[PDB]
Every structure is written in structure tokens, then in C-alpha cells.
Amino acid sequence: MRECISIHVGQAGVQIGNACWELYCLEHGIQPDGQMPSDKTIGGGDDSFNTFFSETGAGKHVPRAVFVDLEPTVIDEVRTGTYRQLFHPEQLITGKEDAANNYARGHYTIGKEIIDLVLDRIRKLADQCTGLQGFLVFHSFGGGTGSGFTSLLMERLSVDYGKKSKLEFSIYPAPQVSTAVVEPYNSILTTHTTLEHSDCAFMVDNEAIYDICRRNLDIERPTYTNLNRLISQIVSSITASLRFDGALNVDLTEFQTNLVPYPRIHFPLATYAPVISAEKAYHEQLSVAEITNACFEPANQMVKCDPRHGKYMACCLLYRGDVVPKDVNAAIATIKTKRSIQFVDWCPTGFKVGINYQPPTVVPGGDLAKVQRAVCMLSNTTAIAEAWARLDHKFDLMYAKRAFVHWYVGEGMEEGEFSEAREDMAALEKDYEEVGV
Amino acid sequence: MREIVHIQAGQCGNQIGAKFWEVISDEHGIDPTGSYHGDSDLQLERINVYYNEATGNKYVPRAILVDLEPGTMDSVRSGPFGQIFRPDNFVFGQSGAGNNWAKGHYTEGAELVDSVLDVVRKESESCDCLQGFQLTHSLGGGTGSGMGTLLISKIREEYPDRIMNTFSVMPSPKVSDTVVEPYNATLSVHQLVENTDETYCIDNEALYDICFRTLKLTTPTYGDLNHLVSATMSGVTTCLRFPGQLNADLRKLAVNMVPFPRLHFFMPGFAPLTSQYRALTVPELTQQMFDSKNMMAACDPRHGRYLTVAAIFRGRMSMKEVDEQMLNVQNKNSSYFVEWIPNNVKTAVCDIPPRGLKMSATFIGNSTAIQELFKRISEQFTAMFRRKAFLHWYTGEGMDEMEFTEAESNMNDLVSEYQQYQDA
Amino acid sequence: MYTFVVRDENSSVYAEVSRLLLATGQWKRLRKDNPRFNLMLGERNRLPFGRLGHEPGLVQLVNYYRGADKLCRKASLVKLIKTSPELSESCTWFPESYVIYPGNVWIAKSGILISSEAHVIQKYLEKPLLLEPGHRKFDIRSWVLVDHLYNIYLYREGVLRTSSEPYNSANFQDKTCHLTNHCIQKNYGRYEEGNEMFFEEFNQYLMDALNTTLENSILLQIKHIIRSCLMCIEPAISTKHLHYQSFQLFGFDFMVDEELKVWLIEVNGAPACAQKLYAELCQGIVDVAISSVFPLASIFIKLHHHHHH
Amino acid sequence: MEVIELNKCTSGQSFEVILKPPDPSLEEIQKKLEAAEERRKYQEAELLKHLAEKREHEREVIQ
Numbered sequence A: 001m002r003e004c005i006s007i008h009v010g011q012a013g014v015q016i017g018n019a020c021w022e023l024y025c026l027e028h029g030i031q032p033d034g035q036m037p038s039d040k041t042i043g044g045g046d047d048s049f050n051t052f053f054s055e056t057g058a059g060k061h062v063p064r065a066v067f068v069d070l071e072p073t074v075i076d077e078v079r080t081g082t083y084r085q086l087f088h089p090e091q092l093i094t095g096k097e098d099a100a101n102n103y104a105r106g107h108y109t110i111g112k113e114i115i116d117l118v119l120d121r122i123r124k125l126a127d128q129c130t131g132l133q134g135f136l137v138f139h140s141f142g143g144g145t146g147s148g149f150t151s152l153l154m155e156r157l158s159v160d161y162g163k164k165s166k167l168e169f170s171i172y173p174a175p176q177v178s179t180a181v182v183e184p185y186n187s188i189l190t191t192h193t194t195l196e197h198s199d200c201a202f203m204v205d206n207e208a209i210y211d212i213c214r215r216n217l218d219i220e221r222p223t224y225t226n227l228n229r230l231i232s233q234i235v236s237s238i239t240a241s242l243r244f245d246g247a248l249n250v251d252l253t254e255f256q257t258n259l260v261p262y263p264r265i266h267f268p269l270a271t272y273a274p275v276i277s278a279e280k281a282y283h284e285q286l287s288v289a290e291i292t293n294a295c296f297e298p299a300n301q302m303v304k305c306d307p308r309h310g311k312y313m314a315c316c317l318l319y320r321g322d323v324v325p326k327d328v329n330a331a332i333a334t335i336k337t338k339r340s341i342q343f344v345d346w347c348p349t350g351f352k353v354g355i356n357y358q359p360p361t362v363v364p365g366g367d368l369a370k371v372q373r374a375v376c377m378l379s380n381t382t383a384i385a386e387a388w389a390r391l392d393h394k395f396d397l398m399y400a401k402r403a404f405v406h407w408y409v410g411e412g413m414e415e416g417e418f419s420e421a422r423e424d425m426a427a428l429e430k431d432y433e434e435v436g437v
Numbered sequence B: 001m002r003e004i005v006h007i008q009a010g011q012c013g014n015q016i017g018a019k020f021w022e023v024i025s026d027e028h029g030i031d032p033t034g035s036y037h038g039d040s041d042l043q044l045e046r047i048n049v050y051y052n053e054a055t056g057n058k059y060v061p062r063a064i065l066v067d068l069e070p071g072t073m074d075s076v077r078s079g080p081f082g083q084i085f086r087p088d089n090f091v092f093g094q095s096g097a098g099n100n101w102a103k104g105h106y107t108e109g110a111e112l113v114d115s116v117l118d119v120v121r122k123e124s125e126s127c128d129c130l131q132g133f134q135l136t137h138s139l140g141g142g143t144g145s146g147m148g149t150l151l152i153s154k155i156r157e158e159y160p161d162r163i164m165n166t167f168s169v170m171p172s173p174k175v176s177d178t179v180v181e182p183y184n185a186t187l188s189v190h191q192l193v194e195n196t197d198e199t200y201c202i203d204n205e206a207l208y209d210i211c212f213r214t215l216k217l218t219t220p221t222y223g224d225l226n227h228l229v230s231a232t233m234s235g236v237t238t239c240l241r242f243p244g245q246l247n248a249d250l251r252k253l254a255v256n257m258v259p260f261p262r263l264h265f266f267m268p269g270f271a272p273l274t275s276q277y278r279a280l281t282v283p284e285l286t287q288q289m290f291d292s293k294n295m296m297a298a299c300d301p302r303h304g305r306y307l308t309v310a311a312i313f314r315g316r317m318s319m320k321e322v323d324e325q326m327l328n329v330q331n332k333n334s335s336y337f338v339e340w341i342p343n344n345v346k347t348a349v350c351d352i353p354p355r356g357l358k359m360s361a362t363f364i365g366n367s368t369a370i371q372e373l374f375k376r377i378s379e380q381f382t383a384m385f386r387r388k389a390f391l392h393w394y395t396g397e398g399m400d401e402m403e404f405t406e407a408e409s410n411m412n413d414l415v416s417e418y419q420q421y422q423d424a
Numbered sequence C: 001m002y003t004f005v006v007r008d009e010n011s012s013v014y015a016e017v018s019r020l021l022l023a024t025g026q027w028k029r030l031r032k033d034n035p036r037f038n039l040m041l042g043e044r045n046r047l048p049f050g051r052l053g054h055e056p057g058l059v060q061l062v063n064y065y066r067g068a069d070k071l072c073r074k075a076s077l078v079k080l081i082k083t084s085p086e087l088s089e090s091c092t093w094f095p096e097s098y099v100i101y102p103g104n105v106w107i108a109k110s111g112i113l114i115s116s117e118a119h120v121i122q123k124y125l126e127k128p129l130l131l132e133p134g135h136r137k138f139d140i141r142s143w144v145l146v147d148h149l150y151n152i153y154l155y156r157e158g159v160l161r162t163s164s165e166p167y168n169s170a171n172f173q174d175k176t177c178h179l180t181n182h183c184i185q186k187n188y189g190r191y192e193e194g195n196e197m198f199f200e201e202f203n204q205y206l207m208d209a210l211n212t213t214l215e216n217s218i219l220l221q222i223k224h225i226i227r228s229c230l231m232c233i234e235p236a237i238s239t240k241h242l243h244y245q246s247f248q249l250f251g252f253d254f255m256v257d258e259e260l261k262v263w264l265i266e267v268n269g270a271p272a273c274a275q276k277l278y279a280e281l282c283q284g285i286v287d288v289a290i291s292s293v294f295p296l297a298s299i300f301i302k303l304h305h306h307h308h309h
Numbered sequence D: 001m002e003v004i005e006l007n008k009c010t011s012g013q014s015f016e017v018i019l020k021p022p023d024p025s026l027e028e029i030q031k032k033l034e035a036a037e038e039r040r041k042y043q044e045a046e047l048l049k050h051l052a053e054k055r056e057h058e059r060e061v062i063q
């Protein structure tokens, strides 16, 4: 096997990390103390789950995880929480003073004094790896640490680990659950500086997850805990091919090959069904057809957009539970004739199906009901550029007036880096249309 | 970033300042002698923000008391919660400042300033992570205005990266001690434009009107005005003094409220206005806190546009109903919020309500309408200054007319700058 | 109190819809670039559909169906018809049309060339129906309103845009007898006012000259074409289950031949109404398309037909 | 509609179905981190140069 290191930068990164590692532990039967009874080779192994967990002589299974945050309070709740024994203290890195929702403060000012420490703690994990693949980086677009320090990290990782892949799990800003007003700036700035350094990036619009929690889980005012437990189910779906026996998406390089033919256009749209509430008394269990068909409804997408007015470059269906190849092919046939699924001319109109027979694991006392079968579609569609236009428009409105800019400049950053980063986004939007129209 | 250092300068500063520690000590369950007698752990979870822990498990305010005469600081020590303050932090001169900015800033206050800074340095030294400073003062008098703005300048030199916020009571002829207040305020505003991250513009005109018109008090005392200020000061300080999952410090807040550096003069507000039995519904709080009648600065927000709004609700209510009601006023009065800062109204809800009330809301608005305040003081200034009236009091302390002309020009610049964004 | 924006100034139709909304006391107009609206009355080109339906607490509606340009451009309309099964290459109500990029009489269009020598090349209807007295060509315009639920509403008043010159087989270069557009004519107003005949008179002429009615001879075929065209593209454009909702007004241009067969010529995305009918249609757009979505304090015929097979 | 490269195992299976055929260096980073720190320390100098002038005006008035 080949090892994968997960990095969780900033509040959103950290708490989503929490959710994922809690879930990964349930999926692999690993307990809070770190023992895994079903594992028979004590002290090591080259199993599929060992890509995400290392092992010690006492029998503990240890996440290949590094949590970074420029202030203590969030990572302190990992240190004192249910999975405190799971991690070594060196994996959990914290500063004293945060980035104040300021990209420049996170990248340039406070980034510079912690970047070398973080790289060192990452090298401690990379030296336990017999054959490192690369990195899964979790962060927010809107936070200062999430935007600023992530982009600096991604720059240095390309230098120190040039041969390795880098995947992003990115939380795109939603006004309904952010108190930060300067997120458009932060989102564009990080996306400019991280673009050449990220091989495949999975965006998750908090707006989409929030309504899925309202509409389908009946949660009146979704918390971050509600959002994170749902995101982790999606993240797990995506990373299960790395952690379980299988032939589709077995390494980080195969994600880039299958999903990203055009390297700059490396933002695949995730869609996920079914999301069903545990408080729901009577639930009729959905079939392969119904849940596959649910992947082409915008209400289930991680980012709200319209795939009908765009073109696909690649599609991946990743099933969990009671699913057989012929029930999937039948559903794909039915769906092709009813819906608008137009591909680009140079790519084959087709689907890479992956199945795991183990049904989705659900966090006890959580919001999600147990299901017989579930699916996560991963599709690189040009419709997701809708997200960029929106973000870019908001940027343009504020930046025309130089609103909030002095804060960034005041942390050393140059005004020219705003328009420089916006032109890269202006180029990116234009790449999407050339491909999609 | 957790510890805040509070400073209170002059009669007004020390009065509203003493009420602040009266209100918040009650909310954090701290008695007049400094001992804890609460019930919720939430009362002690972020107690370090405003209190130092002392031997015997006593809580001592991180508060520095300043004046150029003993009078008001002897009243504070005699008053209901005066015993809780550290005695070393009572720093005072003798000869006063005679409502004279020059005396506060340049002559009398100069003599005292370095001893006040030593107490600041003392408090600042034993602070795990200092997030910034807050000052209470009036801009109308001598000490709070002159020495307060001098202290702000000296703190910025020694601590250039910490946040400096103020609670600045503006003068008004309606509530007026001396004819020279407009002079004192104009000289101070120029200081605050340069050296503060946020300034909470408490207008005494506005507090008076609220006591007169919308609270049926015929003869309002300073205590009646100070009741409204302490309720508001508790309000703006809640989100740091308690949780609830709000991961914010003064800088984070200042980054999201101040789009332009010079334009950081906020319009504070409070619902319901008190001096009750029926608790207000979420629609009433929302309509009231946006209501001009509940604004602590005497400006009509309809005459300006909001750059940013921050509303923080206190008590047990539906966050759904809050979101709905806050979205209802934006989407039905969208001309009064600038389009070029998307999503500029942000909101929080705290579970713990203040003393007396079952649910309240505190309003912090960075509206361009605040120009009306600075225009009013600029008019009062020019009326006197065009005949060089009362200037002898300042020139006798070594000031030149040039400095007045400058300060006049700087405030008229500030007003022009607010006008720019109101039309864009 | 709802809110809207106006981003089409030329639009004579939605100029009146804007006016009718304002004169109610329950709709406020905002600036062109204000995001906090309920209704967008949007531009023709580059309407930013990606920005709709993303404002918290606002139900957003727009007066255009995204992807409806596939029915309204001529080049795509031909390609839609040849590629869709629901309207095939053997489609009886569409003229034989081809695509080459920049009785054997044809017509080219996107400058209009009618010859045999010589964008889309289309089979030209050599023997059309000719109104008497006059011996002259016409085209019928019907206004269709598709709401947010995809109810297809045909407005009951259409109009014949007539030629005023006798139709000539041999003389192709003379454009005023072959092309029956309103601009090209302005004999401008000899027989009927502004070359505009309405559905009452045209029903009466048919009864007298041809012993039939408009409802039977022509309008059944129109309704079949409107329904067929719109249901074909419903999956591609429908805003059911979507985070913003759409409606749109369309204009369907028809041609009736000598043997009373109706032919589809063009679908019009941003259509202009006839002078008389503005008041009623623009009230109808408000009643059915806007007020359904946003309720305040029939002129249409609904098209639906579930034949079981 | 062809079902290609089917691989099966005890925990799952996977296949493809086709419906139709068709960086700056460590020098440059550590450079431009510091160039912002130069502008940061120039700005803080300008502040303490400006404040130094306020201090000599304060002495000039009392004198």
C-alpha cells in the first residue's frame, strides 16, 4: 500500500477532520482508545486502512493527521474530547493569535512564524511512510487561517514533496452560516495561490449542506455539528476507495486521472443520496435507480448549480451497500434517456462505477438514518463555475470601492495581489466556458 | 487573544465606567467584594476577558481609573461596587482640567500620563494574550477628552498591534456643562480618527431624548443617561464575555465592521429601552433596534446608508425567528444598506439575558448617517471659532490657532468622506 | 411588499409589466444591480442565471427560462427538431430545413435570399393561403406564457401580420409580397389597420370564404405545435425542484398553406406584443406568472393532453 | 452499452460502462514572505516616525 497524510487547517478544517476521523474509526471498527480488535497483525501492516492509520507496538491505530490552527480553542476540544487518546500531541499544532478572517495575516504575517514548525511535524509523519502518496487538505475558503495559511502550506508542500499528489476538501462560503464579511476576498486569494499546487479539489458550499439539513433532516436551524457529520459522510464516500479493498480510485493519482483531464479545471461536483432523517418513523428504502437518479437533482449537490447547462468531462458513481452492477447499468440506461447529460466531444460519454457492499456507517445518536444503499456521484461538470461567478461578482462589488483592503495591505500584502488573483479567476471562468459552450 | 484592559478617564468616563462594572459583575455573579456567588459555569468560562484572579479566589477587574482631580474617583471608591477595583489602579492628579482639552492633553495631563501608563504596563504584563484596550470618556470635558486622547496616542506607541476601542460620550447643548465642549470634541475627534479601531458614539442629545420622549422622564439626571449607556456597554461586550460557538476577538470583529480605516464611528442602540412585565417578541426587538428612536447617536439612519450592521440578541428565542426577522428588514429596506458590501448585516444570539429583561437586543451600526453628528459639532465649533471666542483658555496653555484650523479641517474631511460612500 | 429589478430597457412588454406592478402598492422597484429581489426582469444576452436563487430568505423568480435559446435561435431549432424523437426529421409541421455554415424554391435566413441558386436553408412554401380581396400572404403570431410549474398558457388573442401586395410566383426579388413582417411593410394599411387582422375577423373570413373556423382549421394545429415544442425541451429547462424559478413569454410565428396546413416558422424568445393587446396580456403575465408565486392581498387557454398508449 | 474492466473482490466490485465514445522555489517563497515583512516594518516605522513628531509638538506646546 501507499500512505496518505490528512491535513486540517483552520476551524472548518479541524472540525471536519474531527467528524471524518470519528467516522473512519467506526467504519474500520477502531475505538476511541485506538485499539482495533479485528486487526490481527499487531505492530504493523500493509492493509488498505493502513494508508490512513499507522500502528504502534501496544496496538494503537494512529491517524496520519496533522491539525493546524492559528489559535488554540478549537484544537483544544480535540485534545480534551472523545478521541483525545487517538492522536499524538505533536500532530495537534496551535498558535496563540488567529488570522482575524484576514488572508494576509494568515499567509504572510502569522503564517511565516509557524510554517516551518508545521512542515517539520508533517515530515515526522512522512518518515513513518514506506511509500507516501500525498495529502488530503481540509480547510475553509472564508477564514484567514483556512485561506491564508493553507495557500502557504500548499506552496511549501510542492517544494518539499514535488513527486506527491495534493487533494483539497474546501468549504466554499455561505452567508447564512458565516459571520465573516470579507470571505469573497479570502476565497479568491487562496484559490489563486493554491490553483497550481492542488491536483483535485472537492468544494462543498455550506449553503447546499445547510438546506439538505433543513429539507431532508428536518433540522430547523442546522449547526456546524449537523453540517460536519453530513460532510464527513460525503468525504468518507470519496476516500473509501483508498481505505478499503477495491480496484477503482485506489491511489490519489487515479482521482486526477479519472476526474481531472484539464489540470486547472480540477473542481469535481459531488452529489449525494440518500439523506434521510433518523427521527423519521416510517421510511420506504430507496432503490438503485432512485438513488442514482437522485445524483442528477441539484437539491442533492454539494454546490447548487445546473449540470444541464454545462458539459461533463468525467463521472464517477461510488456506491455503498446492497448494489449489483446490473441494477446500476439499468438505472444509467433509464436516466440517460430522461435527463440532459451532455459530455465534451473529446471525452467518452460513460461512468466509472465503484461498489462497496458495506452500507454507510452512521454516527450513533446522529441525524442520518441507516440506509440499505447509498451513492456519491463525482462529476467534473462545467456547471460548477456558477460558484466562481457568484464569488467573483461579490469580490468585484467590494473591490471596486477598495472596501476592507487596508486590513490586508496593513499586514504587508500589496494591492496588486488583489487584481492579480482576480485575473487568474477571470481566466479560470473563461476556461470553463471554452470547455462548456 | 482573551484579556481586555479597560481604562476610564474623567468624570463621565468614570461614571459610565463604574456602571459597566456594576452591570457585568452582576451578570458574571461577582459580588461587591470580588467573590463569586453564581450558578452557571458559563459565568466563569470567559471571566479572564475582564477580570484578574486574585488570592482567596477573588476576581479583580482589569480596570485603570484615571482623572486629573480626586472628586469623582473618590465617589467611585465610595460607590456600590468601588471595593472591587485594585487600589493601585486609582491614578489621579489634583488641580483638575477645567473642561480644557489643552490642560488634559498638553500640560496638566502630561504630568500624570506616564504614571497611568505604568499601571497599564503592569496589567498588560501579566496577561496571557492581550486582545486590546477599551476606554470610557466624554469628548466634551478636559480630562476624558484631552488626557484620554493623549493616553490613546501613548498606548498606540507602546502597543502598536493591539486593538484600541472607545466608548465616547459626545456633547450636546441639551446636556451641556460649558460652552467650549464643541472645541474639546473637535480636537478629540481628530485624535480618534487616527488612533482608534472602533469608537462607540454615545450622543448625550440622543440619551436625553430617549429619557424624555420615549421613557416619560421629565427631568433626566446623568444616572438616567448612564443607565442606557451601561445596558448598551453590556450589550456590545456580550459576545466576548460569553460563548456561544462565536470564535471572535476584537480584531476579527474590527476586520468585519470597518471597511475604511477612518470610518469606524458606530451608532449604538438597545431594545427594549428601560428605566418590564411583558417580554418583547423577536419582531419587536428587531423593529425597535433598527428604529431611529432607539439610537444612542442622534442621527437618522434614513439620511445615511449602512456599511455594516451587527446585531446581538440576548435570551432564549428561536434563531429561525431571528434569521427571518433580520432578513425581513434588509429585504424590505434594501436601499439603506450599501449593495457593494454583500451580506453586511450579521447576527448572534446569546442564551443568557441581562438583569431584569427576558430578551434584549444590542445594535452596532457603521452608518454614514453619523456625519450628522460631526456636522452638528462642526457647526457649533465654527460659530465660536469664526470670532476666536473662548480661545484664550487654550492659547494660555500653549496651543496655537493653527491646531484648531487643522482639527476643524480634519473633521470636515471626515464628513466629506462619509458623504462619498453615501452616494456611491 | 415584494421587490423586483429591470435589466431590459428596450422590452416594450415588460415595460408595461413593470408599470402594472408599481401601480399596486405591494411591489417596489430596486436598482439594476441590487441582489435582494423577488423578481428579476432580465436582459436578453448574458442573463446571470448562476447568481439567482442564492439570496437567503428570498424566493427568486426570473422572466426567462435558461436554455430556451435552443428553441429561439434558428440554427438550434433545426438541430433540435432533427435530433429529438418527439419532433423528428419526418416532422409534418416544420418546413424542410438544413444547416451549412458561413417545386424547388428555398429560403435562407438567420438580408433574405429566395431563389433556386444562392445560416439555415429552408423549404419555401410556394403555394400559401392568400387572403381575399387582396390575393396576399400573412403570418400568424400567438403569444405563449410558460409559468414556473410549466403550465403552457396560450393567450386567446393572436394576430395575422399581413402583406398588402399580391403574391407573385415568378417575381422573387420583390420583398414586400413574399416577406410579411411588420417593419418591412412600413399599401401600408389598405385592407386592415397597420397590416394587423385579429382573431374575430379571421374566424369570420374563414366561415364566409372557406365554410370552416379558426378553432378547427388552424388553431388545433397551433396548439399541437406549441405543446409539442415546449414539452420536448421541458426536461432541459424546467425549474421544478430548482433553487430559483423561471417563467417566460414566447411568440410563435405560423404560416397556413392553401390546403389549410399550419407550419412553424420561428419561436421568439423576447417577443413584442401588438399595440391593442398590451394591456390585457401584460395583466395576464402578472396574474398567472407573477402573482401565483407572490400572492397579493381566464384570458389564457391551458395546453394539456394525456392520450393513453 | 458495454460493461468493461469488471474487477470483483469480497468487499465490493467496480467497472466502467461506456454509452458512447468521443511552481516557485524555496528561494522565491522565502523571498516574497520577507518582502511583505519589509513593507510591514516600513509601515510601522512611518507610524512611529509620525508619533515621534506628535511627541515633539507636545513638548513645543508646554514649552
Ligand SMILES: Nc1nc2c(ncn2[C@@H]2O[C@H](COP(=O)(O)OP(=O)(O)OP(=O)(O)O)[C@@H](O)[C@H]2O)c(=O)[nH]1
Residues within 6 Å of the ligand: A009, A010, A011, A012, A013, A015, A016, A070, A071, A098, A099, A100, A101, A102, A139, A140, A141, A142, A143, A144, A145, A146, A147, A171, A172, A173, A174, A177, A178, A179, A180, A183, A206, A224, A227, A228, A231
Ligand atoms: N462546514 C463548516 N464550515 C465552517 C466550520 N467552521 C467554520 N466554517 C466556515 O468557514 C468560514 C470561516 O472560516 P474558519 O475556518 O472559521 O476560519 P479559520 O480558518 O479559523 O481562520 P481565522 O478565524 O481567520 O483564524 C465560514 O464560511 C464558516 O461558515 C465548520 O465546522 N463546518
Ligand SMILES: Nc1ncnc2c1ncn2[C@@H]1O[C@H](COP(=O)(O)OP(=O)(O)CP(=O)(O)O)[C@@H](O)[C@H]1O
Residues within 6 Å of the ligand: C095, C107, C109, C122, C123, C124, C125, C126, C128, C138, C139, C178, C179, C180, C181, C253, C255, C265, C266, C267, C268
Ligand atoms: N418556408 C417559408 N415559407 C413561406 N414563407 C416563409 C418561410 N420562411 C419564412 N417565411 C416568411 O418570411 C417572413 C420572415 O421570416 P422569419 O419568420 O423566418 O424570420 P423573422 O425574424 O422576420 C420572424 P420574427 O422577427 O417575428 O421572429 C415571415 O413573415 C414568413 O412569412
Ligand SMILES: Nc1nc2c(ncn2[C@@H]2O[C@H](COP(=O)(O)OP(=O)(O)O)[C@@H](O)[C@H]2O)c(=O)[nH]1
Residues within 6 Å of the ligand: B009, B010, B011, B012, B013, B015, B016, B097, B098, B099, B138, B139, B140, B141, B142, B143, B144, B145, B169, B170, B171, B172, B175, B176, B177, B181, B204, B207, B222, B223, B225, B226
Ligand atoms: N452621559 C453622560 N455624560 C456626562 C456625564 N458626566 C459628564 N458628562 C458630559 O461630559 C462632558 C463634560 O466632561 P467631564 O467628563 O465632566 O469632564 P472631565 O471630568 O474633565 O473628563 C459634558 O458634555 C457632559 O454633558 C455622565 O455621567 N453621563
Ligand SMILES: CC(C)(C)c1nc[nH]c1/C=c1\[nH]c(=O)/c(=C/c2cc(F)ccc2F)[nH]c1=O
Residues within 6 Å of the ligand: A179, B134, B165, B166, B198, B235, B236, B237, B238, B239, B240, B241, B246, B248, B250, B253, B254, B256, B257, B310, B311, B312, B346, B347, B348, B364
Ligand atoms: C454579531 C457578531 C457576529 C458578534 C459581530 N459581527 C461583527 N460585529 C459583531 C459584533 C460586535 N462587534 C464589535 O466590534 C464589538 C466591539 C467590542 C466588543 C467587545 F467585546 C469589547 C469592546 C468592543 F468595542 N462588539 C460586538 O458585539
Ligand SMILES: [Ca+2]
Residues within 6 Å of the ligand: A039, A040, A041, A042, A043, A044, A045, A046, A047, A055
Ligand atoms: Ca496490522
Ligand SMILES: [Ca+2]
Residues within 6 Å of the ligand: B111
Ligand atoms: Ca504642575
Ligand SMILES: [Mg+2]
Residues within 6 Å of the ligand: A010, A011, A070, A071, A098, A099, A143, A145, B247
Ligand atoms: Mg480561526
Ligand SMILES: [Mg+2]
Residues within 6 Å of the ligand: B011, B141, B177
Ligand atoms: Mg464635569
